[PDB]
Amino acid sequence: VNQRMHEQRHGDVGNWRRPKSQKMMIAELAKPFVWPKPPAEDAREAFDYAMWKKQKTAQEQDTKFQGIRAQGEVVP
Amino acid sequence: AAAAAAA
Amino acid sequence: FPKKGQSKGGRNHSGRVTVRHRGGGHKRRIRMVDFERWIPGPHTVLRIEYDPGRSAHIALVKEEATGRKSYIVAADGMRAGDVVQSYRSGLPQDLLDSMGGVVDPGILAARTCWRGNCLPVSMIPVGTQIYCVGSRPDGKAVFCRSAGTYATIISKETGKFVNVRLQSGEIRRVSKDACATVGIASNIMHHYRQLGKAGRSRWLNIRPTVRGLAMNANDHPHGGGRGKSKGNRHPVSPWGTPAKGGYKTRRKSNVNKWVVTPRVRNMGVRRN
Amino acid sequence: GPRPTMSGATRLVQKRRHGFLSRVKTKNGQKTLKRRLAKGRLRLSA
Amino acid sequence: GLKYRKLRLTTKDVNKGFYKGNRTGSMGTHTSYGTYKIDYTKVRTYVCPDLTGFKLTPFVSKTIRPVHDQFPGDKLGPKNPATYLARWKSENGLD
RNA sequence: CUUGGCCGUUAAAUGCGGUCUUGCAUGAAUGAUGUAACGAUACAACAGCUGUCUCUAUGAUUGACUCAGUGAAAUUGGAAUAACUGUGCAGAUACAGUUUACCUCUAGUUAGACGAGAAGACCCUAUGCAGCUUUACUGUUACUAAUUAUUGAAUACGAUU
RNA sequence: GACAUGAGUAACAAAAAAGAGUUUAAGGUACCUAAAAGGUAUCUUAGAGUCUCGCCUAAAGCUUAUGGCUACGUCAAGUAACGGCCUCUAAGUUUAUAAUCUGAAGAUUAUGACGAUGAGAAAACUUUGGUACCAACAUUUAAAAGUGAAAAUUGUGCAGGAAGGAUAAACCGUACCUAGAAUCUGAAACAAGUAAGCUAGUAGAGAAUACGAAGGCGUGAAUGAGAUAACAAUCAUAAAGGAACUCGGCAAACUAACUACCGUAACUUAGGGAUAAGGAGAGCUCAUUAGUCUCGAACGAGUAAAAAGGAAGAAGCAUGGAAUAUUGUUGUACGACUGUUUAAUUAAAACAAAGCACUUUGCAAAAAGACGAUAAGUCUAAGUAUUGAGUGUGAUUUCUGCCCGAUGCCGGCUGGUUAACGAAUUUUC
RNA sequence: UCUUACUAUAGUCAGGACUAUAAAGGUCCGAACGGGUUAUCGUUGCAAAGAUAUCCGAAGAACUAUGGUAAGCGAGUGAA
RNA sequence: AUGUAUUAAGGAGAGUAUAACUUAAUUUAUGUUUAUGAUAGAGGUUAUCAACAUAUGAACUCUUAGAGAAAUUACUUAAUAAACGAAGUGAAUUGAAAUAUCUUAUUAACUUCAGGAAAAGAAAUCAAACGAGAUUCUAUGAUUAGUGUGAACGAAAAUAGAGCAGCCUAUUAAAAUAAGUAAAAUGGCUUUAAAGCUGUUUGAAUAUUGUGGGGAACCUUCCUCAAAGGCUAAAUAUAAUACAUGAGUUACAGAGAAAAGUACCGUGAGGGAAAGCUUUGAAAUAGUAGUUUU
Ligand SMILES: [K+]
Ligand SMILES: [K+]
Ligand SMILES: [K+]
Ligand SMILES: [K+]
Ligand SMILES: [K+]
Ligand SMILES: [K+]
Ligand SMILES: [K+]
Ligand SMILES: [K+]
Ligand SMILES: [K+]
Ligand SMILES: [K+]
Ligand SMILES: [K+]
Ligand SMILES: [K+]
Ligand SMILES: [K+]
Ligand SMILES: [K+]
Ligand SMILES: [K+]
Ligand SMILES: [K+]
Ligand SMILES: [Mg+2]
Ligand SMILES: [Mg+2]
Ligand SMILES: [Mg+2]
Ligand SMILES: [Mg+2]
Ligand SMILES: [Mg+2]
Ligand SMILES: [Mg+2]
Ligand SMILES: [Mg+2]
Ligand SMILES: [Mg+2]
Ligand SMILES: [Mg+2]
Ligand SMILES: [Mg+2]
Ligand SMILES: [Mg+2]
Ligand SMILES: [Mg+2]
Ligand SMILES: [Mg+2]
Ligand SMILES: [Mg+2]
Ligand SMILES: [Mg+2]
Ligand SMILES: [Mg+2]
Ligand SMILES: [Mg+2]
Ligand SMILES: [Mg+2]
Ligand SMILES: [Mg+2]
Ligand SMILES: [Mg+2]
Ligand SMILES: [Mg+2]
Ligand SMILES: [Mg+2]
Ligand SMILES: [Mg+2]
Ligand SMILES: [Mg+2]
Ligand SMILES: [Mg+2]
Ligand SMILES: [Mg+2]
Ligand SMILES: [Mg+2]
Ligand SMILES: [Mg+2]
Ligand SMILES: [Mg+2]
Ligand SMILES: [Mg+2]
Ligand SMILES: [Mg+2]
Ligand SMILES: [Mg+2]
Ligand SMILES: [Mg+2]
Ligand SMILES: [Mg+2]
Ligand SMILES: [Mg+2]
Ligand SMILES: [Mg+2]
Ligand SMILES: [Mg+2]
Ligand SMILES: [Mg+2]
Ligand SMILES: [Mg+2]
Ligand SMILES: [Mg+2]
Ligand SMILES: [Mg+2]
Ligand SMILES: [Mg+2]
Ligand SMILES: [Mg+2]
Ligand SMILES: [Mg+2]
Ligand SMILES: [Mg+2]
Ligand SMILES: [Mg+2]
Ligand SMILES: [Mg+2]
Ligand SMILES: [Mg+2]
Ligand SMILES: [Mg+2]
Ligand SMILES: [Mg+2]
Ligand SMILES: [Mg+2]
Ligand SMILES: [Mg+2]
Ligand SMILES: [Mg+2]
Ligand SMILES: [Mg+2]
Ligand SMILES: [Mg+2]
Ligand SMILES: [Mg+2]
Ligand SMILES: [Mg+2]
Ligand SMILES: [Mg+2]
């Protein structure tokens, strides 16, 4: 079983609660099974990886800018 | 507390 | 069986200290001692044991008829191998048919008034020392069970009672069928021992005793004052009971109808 | 002054003193729950 | 403790005999020496039929527009016990 | 009273130890009294030892100091906030008179600002409190004593008359 | 509530400690270059790592608890190499049942249930009461030897040392942190505090003392670099003197541990005092060897064997060479003593204490004493006058005198008094 | 869940010395550990009780851990 | 805040189409009216472009079987908060300028029992020589009568209004008309000394052909009522929801709560925030500029 981090009901407001835990199971197969390798970054165009990567970095920087502010700092 | 006392 | 629980610390079922100066002693076990001795027949003393929760010594006897073993208060001088018998449930046939008569007050005493034998106080002749005197016709022994204690038979009555002088010197009326073991309670040298140190008292479940003079006026009638002061206050207990002067703590409505000659009060005079 | 009285504190004793079963199963404990419930508390015990 | 002590105690916080299940069900009984014998009368199985040749899929073409059933004059249209019995006679009378 | 007299200890003894004791106001289980042993108890002396001192000096590290970064607190009616003598709610940076002083910082220092901190524990007040005490006032109990009731007899013995 | 002052001041000093290279990602500048790009160097933010140096080390290390506002891909039928759940019960708990007591609430006793800090089959395959018991202490034992556990064996002292049950693999826990370097408790990133196992080696009687292999660390710029005033802290040394200081030898210094070493006073409860005091020896090198061990062949040789060893020798200012163990003696007061006490201003002469003494308790249904809105009832105690409770004193030597008037308690008359009760009376409307 | 006492189940005390014992001692020296004697520092402290040195006990009336019990009309607990 | 209407067990945990709420978390049908409504198209996720009324599938876990460390175990078609009501028990602060009786006060609080309300209730009541005609709520009577040393405490008749309902054959099923009762002494409560309640010890009578109780010490005549047996709606108390009104509030106001009994504090009982919007931008305060003085 994998526990979950305790959190407030509305993120930063509400009572402190804990979501339901997660249960993972590992079966010892009788016949082997191998997963395929993920496509190369230059071959994920069917999923719009180009646009999704730009949005991820934009959100990635937004979380780093907030982390700097949470420390009581500002980007010179 | 203060030790100065005019007892 | 083991002696454990908060009662070892002086607490009752409520959890509060009802007996002061108790707790912290050595782990003990209670010995089931036989104070009635109804089963007749010869009993062989296997060994004289030491009882922690008792002043005298206990003897592990063995019933030669069934082999059952039991404990009894050992007499002064009783050793392993000695044979004891309890004539409380009546006299045996072999002893009754020997004389032939209904009762022979002479020979019965010569064969049954032996050290360690339990007999009714009526079957014991006058002047004999006993140490397990009973009270009721079918009650266990209650008097003179401590070490070195004994009682003498003063006179007998046709009557339902017999007079005996207890260890305290009280000549009182005892039942006719009351049990009594001939001899003296073993360990006669118990009241001569000296502990030697405070730690030996803590092993015996005895905790320190604080004097009333050492407390404040709030927790004792003797407390208060500057320096060592009794306070012009007559000695009393922490609850107001006189501790000296002769105040009897026996209930007045409970008159002792079995007392023939009451104890001799010393009246505060020095003995030595 | 205040003392560090919660040092070495176990959560087994938190449930035996201020738990929920220690109140629904007692006469005085039902008042605490009924009081905290009338006030609107979410944490009725422990 | 200050605040974490005020959360709901879980099995991942204490070990001194604190046990709490996940409502997985009872599959047997405990023994007097700490083991577990599974009673297969309580174990549950999953009856999955043979899907070979089955043509129905979980989606229906959007060309077939949704249409609800009509039961004029009947308040308990779909739940009418009479239309089920009368329909049973003509279609299947034996069973 | 008093550093009581005397003897020993000190070059010098209001101390300590011994003794004399006419003890403001010692005393026998509120125990009296003398040893061995024990003591982070208290007092006094000796030997050794030393920067404790005569009398301080030098050296080391960390602070103090400067530069760069981060960044408090008590405190504060407002201040252009000198000295003396006098004055005055009676101890003046601020009033009177005289004197002195170019403007502004830094590191030291603590004489004053009756400096800061805590609506003084001392003392007194209030027909204010709390605990304790007792032969304070008024009360409640433990406990003791008599008796109706639950509860009926029999002799007596005797006294009222 | 906002914003000033102090003040851009204090502070970022656990006496471990840092120095010089390398390097990744993202971004900001300068130049090359004007086809955008890319390259070189540099700065910022978040990292990683190499060499050298130092600190901790019976830890500031590793493995795990209590716990957790650190983080969620942490994986077990059982043993070796695992706990819980489950079974059994202790101290106790009970809005369970019955009985009893009780102004209600409730309380009591029995039984049941529940309750670990304990006990639970086998496995490198597995499913009666000393004929005793598994408290403390000591002893012996897996046969090459030594050491440390497990369990057992035997014995010793008194303080006399649990209970109960037996005998084809579900569910829950498994991450990370252990407090000197980012996580627990102390309001916090606090020089404090917190459980168990392991915790290299040298050297020692030792877990002391010194070094420190591995490991970790030398903090989140919560800092870094300089200079080395006064003064402060923490230290080192010191001419001559050696308590002249001071309330007072406060502090500091002297002393110190070791040996199977010599010696040791008054006094004494005969045990002590005593490790008294006061002296002697110590490291390196070596002659020498009864046995043990080794090598060669009884004997010979050997310390590249453990030990023994001496009035032997060498060198230096010095061989308890560095670190670790804080003086000796004497006369009194108080308390016998070991102990305990105002957590966080008084550790003592106070409290306790063994001992001593007095009062109290006969147990026939309640021993007295304590507790019980108040009882049943509980401790006392499965005790019995050599028992228990209360009071004072405070081991032991030598002793403890006079007064029973006052006060208290105890006992006592065919007594006086004597409320209720009541013979005999007496009124208002 | 601090603390005082009691209670149940458990755990810890290097090494050495003296003593009648191989083991019988509120014995001795001294770590862990537990106390907190004196002194200095600190006092808006690292700390609303700390740091360093010194000192005391360290087989016992010892210390420690996990549970349990007794406290707020009467006073729980109290080597006071 | 008040008023009116309706209603009569409340919360939490976790999960889920983040207007949609329970693992079916946006179920499936009927009727009418649909712009003269109600108060001749496009659109099934590019969704719900339809309101009203009546039905309907689903609706987990805990409180809430037993146990336990609530949301677990193990079982199973196991399931009811607070406020208000009656009785029992029953203080103190305070006032008296101290303080005992008294007052605070038949108060607060606690315990038991009960329902959507409960309790009470159809005169052994009051009146005064005339008469009224159950209970309950509100006002007047009344800072009255009266008690109390005082301080203070404090009725009833009657009146007005809200409601109105009487009965035993009770619209729910009860009486053969009530004896250890009325009453007395004594110890208390209440109170004006009566009446009423009550522990202890004692202890009656039988209807206006004048038996019993009451009419405020007590006796007597008269009047009045008929105890020791019962049923009874409404007006009333509390909570929830909705609506109406406002010289009520408009964000340090109004509820503590415009996202709240949440965050946070405390071992615990318990204590308990801040925070609206796109508008306006005062004072203090800070760095500068202009003029001016130093
Ligand atoms: K964990
Ligand atoms: K001592
Ligand atoms: K003045
Ligand atoms: K100054
Ligand atoms: K398992
Ligand atoms: K009761
Ligand atoms: K010193
Ligand atoms: K030498
Ligand atoms: K004393
Ligand atoms: K004394
Ligand atoms: K006298
Ligand atoms: K007398
Ligand atoms: K202590
Ligand atoms: K009046
Ligand atoms: K009356
Ligand atoms: K009637
Ligand atoms: Mg005692
Ligand atoms: Mg004593
Ligand atoms: Mg004592
Ligand atoms: Mg005192
Ligand atoms: Mg007193
Ligand atoms: Mg005196
Ligand atoms: Mg405190
Ligand atoms: Mg603790
Ligand atoms: Mg944990
Ligand atoms: Mg368990
Ligand atoms: Mg005396
Ligand atoms: Mg600076
Ligand atoms: Mg002047
Ligand atoms: Mg002026
Ligand atoms: Mg200064
Ligand atoms: Mg001024
Ligand atoms: Mg300054
Ligand atoms: Mg400065
Ligand atoms: Mg500085
Ligand atoms: Mg770059
Ligand atoms: Mg059980
Ligand atoms: Mg366990
Ligand atoms: Mg720390
Ligand atoms: Mg540390
Ligand atoms: Mg912390
Ligand atoms: Mg060490
Ligand atoms: Mg570490
Ligand atoms: Mg560094
Ligand atoms: Mg010198
Ligand atoms: Mg010199
Ligand atoms: Mg001098
Ligand atoms: Mg001088
Ligand atoms: Mg030389
Ligand atoms: Mg002493
Ligand atoms: Mg103190
Ligand atoms: Mg001290
Ligand atoms: Mg003596
Ligand atoms: Mg009794
Ligand atoms: Mg005398
Ligand atoms: Mg006399
Ligand atoms: Mg009378
Ligand atoms: Mg505790
Ligand atoms: Mg010792
Ligand atoms: Mg300072
Ligand atoms: Mg010692
Ligand atoms: Mg020691
Ligand atoms: Mg249940
Ligand atoms: Mg359930
Ligand atoms: Mg009225
Ligand atoms: Mg007056
Ligand atoms: Mg009638
Ligand atoms: Mg009556
Ligand atoms: Mg009358
Ligand atoms: Mg009447
Ligand atoms: Mg009248
Ligand atoms: Mg508000
Ligand atoms: Mg506004
Ligand atoms: Mg403005």
TrEMBL record, chain D:
Highest taxon listed in the record's lineage: Eukaryota
Family indicated by similarity: Belongs to the bacterial ribosomal protein bL34 family.
Protein name according to UniProt: Related to ribosomal protein L34, mitochondrial
Phylogenetic placement of the source organism: Eukaryota, Fungi, Dikarya, Ascomycota, Pezizomycotina
Gene: B11N2.075
